[PDB]
Write a protein that binds this ligand. Structure first.
Ligand SMILES: [Zn+2]
Length: 359
């Protein structure tokens, strides 16, 4: 019943939530594999699609909602020329240096709207041919670029399929000072990770417009997965012949704290798990030693993450780990009132034994 024991019990509660999630993931994977086989057999601009096995499930940090999954389909696109749409690196237009994607251009700019419309049309046709699993495509929602499958097993699982372009070019200059892992995972790892492809995911800016509709955000979901699964200064961190740390446990707890708060308070709508992930990436940089994340320090490590997060809220600053000029907590993206509200709620939990965990 002490504070430390209670936090360990929350981790036990999250451990129990995993079984339903793992079972659901196996059903999701069967459907997704079936669909990818169909899309790989059919002749189209999307024939080369593959699953990118990233996101919270494959990082082992999906803590809730066994009825909701996101999956990314990557498509290699040669000779992408990027234009920064926001010079922070928050958004890009895609242009090209014939061209396999020529049907989806609006002038020299790749239309996410056109490309996604065709993606959706094909998915819808091919899903109707999957006869031995109960699966349909959800009606398109304006402003939602994912193509959502509805699987009945017999319970309903929603799967959001996100198209990601893959570029094998050098990472965008907005990322030059990003991935600050040099004192933690080191310079050789950083070099190696930056030699890997990067991804572009459709996302509407919702700004002045014109090319509202045709903007893309950068995605490093592969790099993030690698970091989560290779997160120690020692190569053996959390392996069978190494020592456990509490890095992922702290991420899980903080994600759960935010999830529980968000369920109760619609004033926290603008926050999301990626804020917590980004914060913990910075914490792992700040405190690189595995000994700083000893399992015995679960409570103190959790508390330092909350303190760091509260300082990000106070300063309205949380830099994208890969794109340092992109401030996820800018005044423009999140109102001061929302940040002050979340600060208050976090301090309350922290000072009163985290009652919200129990809801
Ligand atoms: Zn570890």
């Amino acid at each position: 019943g002490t504070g430390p024991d209670k936090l360990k019990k929350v981790l036990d509660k999250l451990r129990l939530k995993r079984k339903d999630i793992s079972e659901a993931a196996e059903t999701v994977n069967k459907v997704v594999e079936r669909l990818l086989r169909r899309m790989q057999k059919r002749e189209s601009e999307f024939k080369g699609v593959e699953q990118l096995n990233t996101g919270s499930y494959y990082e082992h940090v999906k803590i809730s909602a066994p009825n909701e999954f996101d999956v990314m389909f990557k498509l290699e696109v040669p000779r992408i020329e990027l234009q920064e749409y926001y010079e922070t690196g928050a958004f890009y237009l895609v242009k090209f240096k014939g061209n396999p994607l020529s049907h989806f251009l609006e002038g020299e700019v790749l239309s996410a709207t056109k490309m996604l419309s065709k993606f959706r049309k094909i998915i819808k046709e091919e899903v109707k041919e999957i006869k031995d699993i109960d699966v349909s495509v959800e009606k398109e929602k304006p402003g939602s670029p994912a193509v959502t499958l509805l699987i009945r097993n017999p319970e309903e699982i929603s799967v959001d399929i996100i198209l990601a372009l893959e570029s094998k070019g050098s990472w965008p200059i907005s990322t030059k000072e990003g991935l600050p892992i040099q004192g933690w995972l080191g310079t050789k790892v950083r070099t190696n990770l930056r030699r890997e492809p990067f991804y572009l995911v459709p996302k509407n800016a919702k700004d002045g417009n014109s090319f509202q509709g045709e903007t893309w955000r950068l995605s490093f979901s592969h790099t993030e997965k690698y970091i989560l699964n290779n997160h120690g200064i020692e190569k053996t961190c959390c392996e069978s012949s190494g020592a456990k740390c509490c890095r992922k446990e702290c991420l899980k707890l903080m994600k759960y704290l935010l999830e529980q708060l968000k369920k109760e308070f619609q004033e926290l709508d603008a926050f999301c798990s990626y804020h917590v992930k980004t914060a913990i990436f910075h914490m792992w940089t700040q405190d690189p030693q595995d000994s700083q994340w000893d399992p015995r320090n679960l409570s103190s490590c959790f508390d330092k993450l909350l303190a760091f997060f509260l300082e990000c809220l106070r300063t309205e600053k949380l830099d994208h780990y890969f794109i340092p000029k992109f401030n996820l907590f800018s005044q423009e993206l999140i109102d001061r009132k929302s940040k002050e509200f979340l600060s208050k709620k976090i301090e309350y939990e922290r000072n009163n034994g985290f009652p919200i965990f129990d809801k």
